[PDB]
């Protein structure tokens, strides 16, 4: 059980032995912005070399796969297999597939190009795609709200027009509230959409992101892999560590990110068990030691 | 205490005679769309005449007052003081007034031309608003979220950007989550704009409309009310009703709009008392017997 200890000396190295895998959320872990943890591409090395499995865990659905393995080669982290790589965005589109119900549907998506490229990529048609000839738009099964930049009051009507039909599945890629910029603003997530959508339309989403467990079945199809001989590594209490925590996994917050040690020792004196991380370390950069 | 009984009768009779006024929510009591509730002239016609106090409570904040009382006699609602009716954009601009902090500060509006002419009514300044010669910007010290049909992901960014100040006010006009049409169809309410910004922010608003109690400090401004004496009547339990058990006031639904009696009976066997209504007609039509 979490009792929030700092991970170093033989502990780290026999948490570190026994693991078998290793689970990284990226922003905030891996690097800030356009710059990398320092020492973060050499644990990612170090690890691959002892040979313990790498995966990366994300909440981005602004961007599909070949373009988010992008920015791995560009902050120092080569050799990466795109099959390494799981965001909400690919995950939604897996589920959506998987659920999608009515006869052997259109999703209606709030999202970017990126989200889409992903959703078409798994089968799905879309909403506002051009239609067959001049036949009918066909009908809309889901809605997913997903990071959108563009939304708008518009685009919030027309996600209840769909959700009037109860049997439209309502769908979010995450709950983030909001994302920390390089020059020190936020900016809103998708979790303030979807609360907005949930709102107007009276539903509660389907969540595909951390810390949701679907995201956990996702990447285990891919994928078997033990959680209790598993680590998960993230900055952001709520998220990766509660994740962590609902997946049977050994967490590790480093605080290169969102959450403050103070937060994490304010929930263990509160017996709020499954925000508390297992271990923290100042950075990644202090796990290569352990190996 | 409350218990869901129908309105007829010698109790009818008693519980008119008693009141001293009667406060009344406006769409799906008084009208629906373009239509009046048939009767519902008439009620207020012979209430004026038994020396009975009416006024009118809106969470409207789309439309500054003296708009909102057009639409009074246009519907068969003659007579009308302007006086006589309440809605949140009209007390959120006198709310914003009182307690507007920063030395003897802008308000950064989500919402229509309606509301913005109703704040500027107030004296406030806001933002986005031309400035004075080419000085700066004037600083934003509250935030207030209307019925912005206009609402866009951008403006969702510029309020938190705002809100960073934690002495910036958040505040909000009500927290409807949707509205019926006439057709049948559904529109977004001020609610999920609010509940959009309060998640991106991590901020909680400050409610003008009903439920809040600061309503009936505002209708109690320009009035003295014995809310003992008074009733409240309305067509949606987590409104109209919460807000009249909230203010001391016997309550009464009106089954011509969006809360079924259905509802009603099952929150008083769930015993959530301040849901539950004291009376029920079927439509306003219906009281104007007891008088
Ligand atoms: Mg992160
Ligand atoms: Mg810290
Ligand atoms: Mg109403
Ligand atoms: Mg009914």
Redesign the pocket.
């Known amino acids: 059980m979490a009792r929030c200890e700092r991970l170093r000396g033989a502990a780290l190295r026999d948490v570190l032995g026994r693991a078998q895998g290793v689970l990284f959320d990226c922003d905030g872990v891996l690097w800030n912005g356009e710059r990398a943890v320092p020492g973060a591409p050499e644990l990612l090395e170090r690890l691959a070399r002892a040979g313990k499995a790498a995966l990366f865990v994300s909440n981005n659905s602004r961007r599909a796969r070949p373009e988010l393995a992008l920015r791995f080669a560009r902050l120092g982290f080569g050799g990466l297999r795109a099959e390494q790589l799981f965001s909400s965005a690919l995950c939604a589109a897996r589920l959506l597939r998987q659920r999608l119900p009515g006869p052997p549907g259109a999703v209606f998506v709030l999202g970017g190009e990126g989200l889409r490229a992903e959703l078409r990529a798994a089968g799905l048609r879309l909403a506002g795609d051009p239609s067959a000839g001049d036949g009918a738009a066909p009908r809309v099964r889901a809605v997913l709200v997903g990071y959108d930049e563009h939304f708008s009051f518009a685009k919030l009507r027309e996600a209840c027009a769909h959700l009037r039909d109860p049997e439209c599945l309502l769908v979010a890629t995450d709950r983030d509230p909001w994302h920390p910029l390089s020059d020190g603003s936020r900016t809103p997530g998708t979790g303030s959409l979807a609360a907005a959508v949930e709102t107007a339309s009276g539903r509660q989403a389907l969540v595909v992101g951390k810390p949701s467990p679907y995201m956990f079945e996702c990447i285990t199809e891919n994928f078997s892999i033990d959680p209790a001989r598993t680590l998960m590594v993230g900055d952001r209490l709520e998220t990766d560590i509660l994740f962590g925590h609902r997946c049977g996994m050994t967490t590790v917050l480093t605080?290169t990110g969102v959450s403050?040690?103070?937060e994490a020792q304010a929930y263990l004196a509160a017996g709020q068990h499954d925000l508390v991380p297992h271990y923290y370390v100042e950075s990644i950069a202090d796990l290569t030691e352990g190996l």
Chains 1, 2 share one sequence.
């Open positions: 605080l403050r040690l103070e």
